[PDB]
Write a protein that binds this ligand. Structure first.
Ligand code: FZ4
Ligand code: FZ4
Lengths: 87, 87
């Protein structure tokens, strides 16, 4: 659905000649290629292999990102404030 | 306690206009953000996940650091003495 919405939006933006049509077109291209895993389930070779990604792999990747991004922000604000003074 | 002590010290230093108040203020900001894990225990979602850090994760990270830092010093002194002579 997202790939379809962005593609429709990108083509709508291209009609209005706004420069932001290209980023949406490129994001649609990235999402569309990633959507090709949906058709791996049609073959026993690729279907069984791609089972153990959504169950465990994809879930725990989100867990690290949320915790890490919070303290990435905490250190980023710390470094900028401390580095504002020159020698 | 450390975050409170450094924050009090940093504000005390700021009254005396010493430049070292900023590093203590920034260290307090880093520690204060890290103290936010204490409130993860209030939710079942985050409480159970954050259990397996203090028991095993944090302890063994200290083990590597103490052993590695000793021989980091040993190689550092070795490299400087050996690199003192130019070609
Ligand atoms: N040369 C075709 C190999 O096919 B795959 C495959 C073949 C037999 C059994 C299981 C998998 C495959 C390749 C990449 C990713 C996932 C599966
Ligand atoms: N979108 C909320 C996800 O919540 B977390 C979560 C949800 C259900 C079960 C276990 C944990 C979570 C996220 C990051 C780190 C730790 C836990």
């Amino acid at each position: 659905l997202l790939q379809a919405l962005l593609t429709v939006l990108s083509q709508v933006l291209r009609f209005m000649e706004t420069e932001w049509y290209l980023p949406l077109l490129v994001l649609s291209l990235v999402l569309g290629w990633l959507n090709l895993l949906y058709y791996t389930r049609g073959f026993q070779h690729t279907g069984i292999y791609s089972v153990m990604i959504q169950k465990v792999i994809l879930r725990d990747l989100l867990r690290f990102l949320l915790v890490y991004l919070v303290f990435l922000f905490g250190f980023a604000v710390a470094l900028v404030s401390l580095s504002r003074e020159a020698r």
